[PDB]
From a paper:
We first generated a binary complex of caspase-6 with a substrate surrogate covalently bound to the catalytic cysteine (Cys163) by incubating active caspase-6 with a covalent inhibitor (benzyloxycarbonyl (Z)-VEID-tetrafluorophenoxymethyl ketone). The unambiguous electron density for 3 reveals a unique simultaneous binding of substrate and inhibitor that explains the uncompetitive behavior of this series. The carbonyl group of 3 makes a 3.1-Å hydrogen bond with the backbone NH of the P2 Ile of the bound VEID substrate surrogate. The dimethoxyphenyl ring of 3 sits above the oxyanion hole created by the backbone NH group of Cys163; the 4-methoxy phenyl group displaces the water network around the His121-Cys163 catalytic dyad and the scissile bond. The primary alcohol of 3 makes a hydrogen bond interaction with the P3 Glu of VEID and participates in a water-mediated interaction with Arg220 of the L3 loop of caspase-6. The benzonitrile ring of 3 overlaps with the S4 subsite and tucks under the L4 loop of caspase-6, which places the nitrile group close to the sidechains of His168 from the L2 loop and His219 from the L3 loop. The slight difference in the conformation of the L4 loop in the ternary complex in comparison to the conformation in the binary complex is likely due to the benzonitrile ring interaction with residues at the tip of the L4 loop. To better understand this selectivity profile, we superposed the caspase-3/DEVD coordinates onto the caspase-6/VEID/3 ternary structure. Three residues lining the binding site of 3 provide a structural rationale for the selectivity of these inhibitors (Cys264 and Ala269 in the L4 loop and His209 in the L3 loop); we believe that Ala269 is the primary driver of caspase selectivity (amino acids depicted in Figure 5C). The x-ray structure lacks the Rh110 dye, indicating that compound 3 can bind to the VEID/caspase-6 complex in the absence of a prime-side dye.
Caspases are a family of cysteinyl proteases that are key mediators of apoptosis and inflammation. The apoptotic “executioner” caspases (caspases-3, -6 and -7) are translated as proenzymes containing a short pro-domain, a p20 subunit, a linker region, and p10 subunit. The resulting active enzyme is a dimer, wherein each subunit contains a p10 and p20 chain and one active site. Due to the role of caspase-6 in neurodegeneration, there is strong interest in developing selective, small-molecule inhibitors of this enzyme.
Residue numbers in the entry:
A (entry chain A): 31 to 174, 198 to 291
B (entry chain B): 30 to 175, 197 to 291
C (entry chain D), D (entry chain C): 2 to 5
Write the structure that this text describes.
Amino acid sequence: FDPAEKYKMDHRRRGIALIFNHERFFWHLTLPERRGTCADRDNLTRRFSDLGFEVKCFNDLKAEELLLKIHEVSTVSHADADCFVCVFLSHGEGNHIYAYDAKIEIQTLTGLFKGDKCHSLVGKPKIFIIQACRGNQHDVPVIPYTLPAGADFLMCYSVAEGYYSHRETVNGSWYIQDLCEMLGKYGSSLEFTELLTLVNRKVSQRRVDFCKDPSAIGKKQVPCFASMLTKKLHFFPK
Amino acid sequence: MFDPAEKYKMDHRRRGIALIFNHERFFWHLTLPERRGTCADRDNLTRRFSDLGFEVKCFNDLKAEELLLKIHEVSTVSHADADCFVCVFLSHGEGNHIYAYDAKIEIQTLTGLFKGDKCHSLVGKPKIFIIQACRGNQHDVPVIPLVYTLPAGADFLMCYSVAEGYYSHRETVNGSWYIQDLCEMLGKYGSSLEFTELLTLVNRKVSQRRVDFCKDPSAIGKKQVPCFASMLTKKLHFFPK
Amino acid sequence: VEIX
Amino acid sequence: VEIX
Ligand SMILES: COc1ccc(-c2cc(C(=O)N[C@@H](CO)Cc3cccc(C#N)c3)co2)cc1OC
Ligand SMILES: COc1ccc(-c2cc(C(=O)N[C@@H](CO)Cc3cccc(C#N)c3)co2)cc1OC
């Protein structure tokens, strides 16, 4: 048993990074436009490409087309790849995000990549990054062998469950900005979860300094990653 | 300067309290079976956690109201003198709740008492919850590999024996898969490894297990992976004090 | 084996 | 600032 064991990241390809980018929504949903999300998408495209990923972006898909796309990806072989990344930039609540015309349960998306559904990813990291609200609380400032089919998922959320997640209308989301900065500086050397912990510290330093809603001033946000990984994860240059 | 190596300060006078809520049996109407094996788990944690400096307090089979009373007391005592806080729950469970003796309790009810705006002497300090309970009714199957302010929600580490939606397993003599492997990894690496690194080892150990014998034949071969959810902002170690 |  |  080896405490330093790492995932084997010496396949021919790093793998695919899917980005689902949602800027606007069917009017009946009554959701506002997500100005700043294009910055987030472009930033991720750049950082993820630099780490060897084949980045595919889709903008404002309807739920049926998104599910179709994601179903396609989960059924092509990843035998040649180190890992898989899937990013969602949208509005959200509870345990769902919004496509153009309807909400989708996060579980619906991750389920397609479970071991018994997606064999060529068994034993490999399956990484989901979600920038969306997770509820309606606004956090406040304070002053200081076989494998399980569920294994090897890493869920990276911009915010802990129950809370608002923040976005600047030009620079993009707090979380994606800080994630991309840390990937830019440390992505090809730091263990990924340690990298995410740095992200938690960056984001938790931010505060709402300006807002159209005065009662939001000073409010806060901490991200949260949920790991079912079984080994150390690195993106060393290939 | 931003320091990628930054650690929590773990040089206070006391490591801190570790509360263990141990549930073995339940009010008869709940119709929940006895959790044979759980005293092994409790005793094992008590020894590992004491060895790491914690002041261990166990409560067995409290009713909901008495448990919430107890946990409320702990959240209002000063922890100005402590490195961190640990709270362990060994019980039955589903969705996002666990059972006390007579009723279920939402996990968020328990964690909420320790948020930064409710528990000031723990602001800035790791708040670690370890939960051995089922999280749903799926049975996982085997597959073969081919100055700055702080948010009130910051600095929590939630360590679940299983991923959301699934059954969590227990042996009737040795205890739960998860707590056995967590204890072994604390035993071997607790006073040296970063704690999240340690939990990832626990993920790997538990995911090697399979149901080898079982009253229910269809359970044979089934599996379990744990999950930890981190809102920590720095590295966490339990070096000898 | 049993379950929780 | 806006929210998601
Ligand atoms: C929170 O509610 C419940 C919690 C636990 C049980 C529960 C546990 C067991 C149990 O451990 N049964 C053992 C009796 O020895 C046989 C068994 C059954 C299913 C899966 C496995 C496995 N592995 C084992 C039966 O019910 C039932 C609940 O209500 C639906
Ligand atoms: C999932 O459903 C929703 C998602 C987002 C909004 C949403 C976002 C904003 C928003 O960003 N408003 C800005 C101005 O556009 C003002 C504001 C309000 C509250 C908190 C902050 C912060 N921080 C900012 C308003 O509604 C509303 C939803 O259901 C009604």
